Amino acid sequence: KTAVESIDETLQRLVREKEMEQNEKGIKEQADDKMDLLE
Amino acid sequence: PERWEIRQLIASGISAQRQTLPVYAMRSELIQAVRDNQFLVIVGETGSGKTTQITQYLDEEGFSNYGMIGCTQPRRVAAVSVAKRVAEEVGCKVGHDVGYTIRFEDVTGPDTRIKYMTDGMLQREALLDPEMSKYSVIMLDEAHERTVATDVLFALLKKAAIKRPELKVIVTSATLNSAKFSEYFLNCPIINIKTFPVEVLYSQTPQMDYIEAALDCVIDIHINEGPGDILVFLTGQEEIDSCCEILYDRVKTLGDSIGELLILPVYSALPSEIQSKIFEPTPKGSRKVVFATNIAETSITIDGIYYVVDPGFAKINIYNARAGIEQLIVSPISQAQANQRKGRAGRTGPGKCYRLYTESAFYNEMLENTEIQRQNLSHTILMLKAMGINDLLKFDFMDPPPKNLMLNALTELYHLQSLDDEGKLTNLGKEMSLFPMDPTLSRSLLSSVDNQCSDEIVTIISMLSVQNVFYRPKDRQLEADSKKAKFHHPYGDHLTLLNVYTRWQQANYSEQYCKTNFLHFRHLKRARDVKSQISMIFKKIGLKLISCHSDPDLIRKTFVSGFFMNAAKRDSQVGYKTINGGTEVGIHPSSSLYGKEYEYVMYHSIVLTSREYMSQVTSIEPQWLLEVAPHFYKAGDA
Amino acid sequence: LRALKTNEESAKMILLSDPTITIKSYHLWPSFTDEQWITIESQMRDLILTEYGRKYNVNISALTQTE
RNA sequence: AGUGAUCUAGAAAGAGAUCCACCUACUCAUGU
Numbered sequence: 126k127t128a129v130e131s132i133d134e135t136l137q138r139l140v141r142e143k144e145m146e147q148n149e150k151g152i153k154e155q156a157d158d159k160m161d162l163l164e
Numbered sequence: 165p166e167r168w169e170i171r172q173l174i175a176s177g178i179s180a181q182r183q184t185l186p187v188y189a190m191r192s193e194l195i196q197a198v199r200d201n202q203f204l205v206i207v208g209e210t211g212s213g214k215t216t217q218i219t220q221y222l223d224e225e226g227f228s229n230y231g232m233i234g235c236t237q238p239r240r241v242a243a244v245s246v247a248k249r250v251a252e253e254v255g256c257k258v259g260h261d262v263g264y265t266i267r268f269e270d271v272t273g274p275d276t277r278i279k280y281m282t283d284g285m286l287q288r289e290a291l292l293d294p295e296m297s298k299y300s301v302i303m304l305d306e307a308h309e310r311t312v313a314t315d316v317l318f319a320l321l322k323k324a325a326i327k328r329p330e331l332k333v334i335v336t337s338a339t340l341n342s343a344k345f346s347e348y349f350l351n352c353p354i355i356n357i358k359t360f361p362v363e364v365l366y367s368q369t370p371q372m373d374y375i376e377a378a379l380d381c382v383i384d385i386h387i388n389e390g391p392g393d394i395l396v397f398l399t400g401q402e403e404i405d406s407c408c409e410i411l412y413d414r415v416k417t418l419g420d421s422i423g424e425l426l427i428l429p430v431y432s433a434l435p436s437e438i439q440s441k442i443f444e445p446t447p448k449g450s451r452k453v454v455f456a457t458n459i460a461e462t463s464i465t466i467d468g469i470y471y472v473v474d475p476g477f478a479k480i481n482i483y484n485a486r487a488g489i490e491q492l493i494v495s496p497i498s499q500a501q502a503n504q505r506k507g508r509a510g511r512t513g514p515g516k517c518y519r520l521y522t523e524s525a526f527y528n529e530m531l532e533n534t535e536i537q538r539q540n541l542s543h544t545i546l547m548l549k550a551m552g553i554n555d556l557l558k559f560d561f562m563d564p565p566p567k568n569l570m571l572n573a574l575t576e577l578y579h580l581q582s583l584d585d586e587g588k589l590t591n592l593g594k595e596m597s598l599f600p601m602d603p604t605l606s607r608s609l610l611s612s613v614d615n616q617c618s619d620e621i622v623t624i625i626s627m628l629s630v631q632n633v634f635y636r637p638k639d640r641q642l643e644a645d646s647k648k649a650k651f652h653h654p655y656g657d658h659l660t661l662l663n664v665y666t667r668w669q670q671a672n673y674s675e676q677y678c679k680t681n682f683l684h685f686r687h688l689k690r691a692r693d694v695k696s697q698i699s700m701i702f703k704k705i706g707l708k709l710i711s712c713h714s715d716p717d718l719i720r721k722t723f724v725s726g727f728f729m730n731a732a733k734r735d736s737q738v739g740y741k742t743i744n745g746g747t748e749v750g751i752h753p754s755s756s757l758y759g760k761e762y763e764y765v766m767y768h769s770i771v772l773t774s775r776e777y778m779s780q781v782t783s784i785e786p787q788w789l790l791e792v793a794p795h796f797y798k799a800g801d802a
Numbered sequence: 803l804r805a806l807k808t809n810e811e812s813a814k815m816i817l818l819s820d821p822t823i824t825i826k827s828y829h830l831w832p833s834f835t836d837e838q839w840i841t842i843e844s845q846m847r848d849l850i851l852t853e854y855g856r857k858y859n860v861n862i863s864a865l866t867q868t869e
Numbered sequence: 870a871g872u873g874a875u876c877u878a879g880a881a882a883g884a885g886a887u888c889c890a891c892c893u894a895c896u897c898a899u900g901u
Contacts, residue, residue, distance in 0.1 A: 126524065127522045127523050127524025127525070127527075127528075128524060130368070130369060130370065130522060130524065131522070131524050131525070131528075131529070134370050147864035147865060150861070150864045151863075151864070151865060151868045154860050154861070154864070155858065155860065158858045158859060158860060161859065238901095239901090240901080267901095284901090399899075400897070400898075400899070401897070401898075402897060431898090431899090432898065432899070432900060432901090433897095433898070457899065457900090458899065458900085459899090459900080463900090478899065479898080479899040479900090480899060480900095481899065481900085492897090492898070492899065493899095494899095495899095629901095630901090631898085631901085632898080752897090753896060753897090769898095771897075771898075773897050773898090774897085775896095777897090779898095
């Protein structure tokens, strides 16, 4: 039914939000590291 | 910046017909309820006969004392037109045994038994008589539209019932869902009553893209479905214009195999003549396609609609009580609205309704009903304190607003001196409650005598109680702006309102000199009748009409003496910047900004669009802020 | 070897922890059994990422190939 | 109806705080 579509859309939006967060959190983590060492 | 460009320039160089309505066939049931119960919910279907019939019902079943019956409508047009019709139905003179009442439009007299008024006007009556003693039954109609004035009347009348056994109260809705309303009025009964049966399509997957999906749905319906007009719903003018140009062009194209298709708009700004074009026939080999806002949800009909779209979005006011700020946000509709939309296909035959979302999202993801959780409460807290309600935070509200927005509203009213610190009505707050305005407008007006310009400030508060006056069509913005300049005042668009009203009252014109000076005649008329009504309240309450000989700085000081809170400094390295909240705004692209004494504005309206804008602005000397509200201009609180 | 390069004598004390487990004459590393190698590898991985967090104040690897 | 007027030029050793212009940039009111 529509519960599968709602759950899959919410899981896709949560996965893309976690991917954007984990892109903000490797390279950019160490960029924040270098900025905190400069502070 | 202006100065630097000048420096570089210098440096360089019939009776039986009404029987037939469905509510007749349950009139017996409708006594037995009315008779047995002090409060009653009735719920219909729009067309079933409730606005007309049920008040008449009540006036045979409940008759002679020195008393009236009110019916209450959220909509001026429904009050007026349904009172005209019900006067004919009785066979009585309009303004006599049946009458209106609307803001600055009363049509009742000492004969009126049956009184069909705006919700806002019954609420003002209840400021002057907190028992509504002059009514023996009060019927709050279209309660599903959950306006501010109906929700405050519902609250009030809850309490008034437990002071007056001889008051009976009838809440009338077009949304079958009464449970919420029964519960809120102490488990009160329900009585549940010509719409044809709408088919309802849903998308299998959430759309992300609802404009282009709505366009393609309307062309699909026009190819494949039999005769019947289409009603799209879309959220604002810019969107609606765009979809009218692109469904007009795509329909011309498919005219190489398909019938003729006439588009129209509809939205809140439209001139009257283009509004009237919505009602045209549906060419001849052919169909029509209204592209409306939510105005076509409830507030009219268009007679031949058989197919509704429904991208389930509208453009709704939202108010944050812990930023302090209203905005105007494209937002998912309520389930009640989605139902109304559907029921516009159904007036004239079976119908279909093509909902650009999932059945799961209708059932489970739209909020039931939409206004008290979407409002600045300042007006509401003035009205409650006039109603004697000393514990605002405890007031019995079927959905209580956030106690922060109530607290912010007392603090505004204290800085407007409507209340004292101890939350008690000053002589201003009394008199302000006598005017049907917001508190900032009312305060401005009141004080205007003591700025020697109460005629001028009466006229500007009348103007600011109506729309924008100035027509600017998307073809002829140069001609419209040329027109507008011949009333403009350089850094004083409030003074521009005074000038165009005075010119409309000039010994030189009416309708066709409105159209040839690109003015809304309907606005200017409405502002003239609200100027007449507000001058009658001024006389009634002893506020002397005053003018001077010609004094713009007096006009400025009066306006500041209401709108003090709504001030916005020029930034001196950046944009414009606001006294309350410390927002970073721009002057609205309607108005140039003479940056040489501009250095403070007073603004009418904050407008949220993708940027922050501030709209209808007039210059102020900041020294005249500090003298006219020293308690709000305390560095100390800053 | 990343554990020896990061913090040398800590990983040497982790190698030279149990005095029973010795090194044969032609071997380099102590002759552990397999669960003993799991314990050694777990302590070395914890040592690497412990001094990596204590050097670069980073929270955790948000991705497996990043780790 | 016009021609014609053409320096330089590299080897050894030693030295020497550099201090300065080649990419443009801004328009929504859902209602009453």
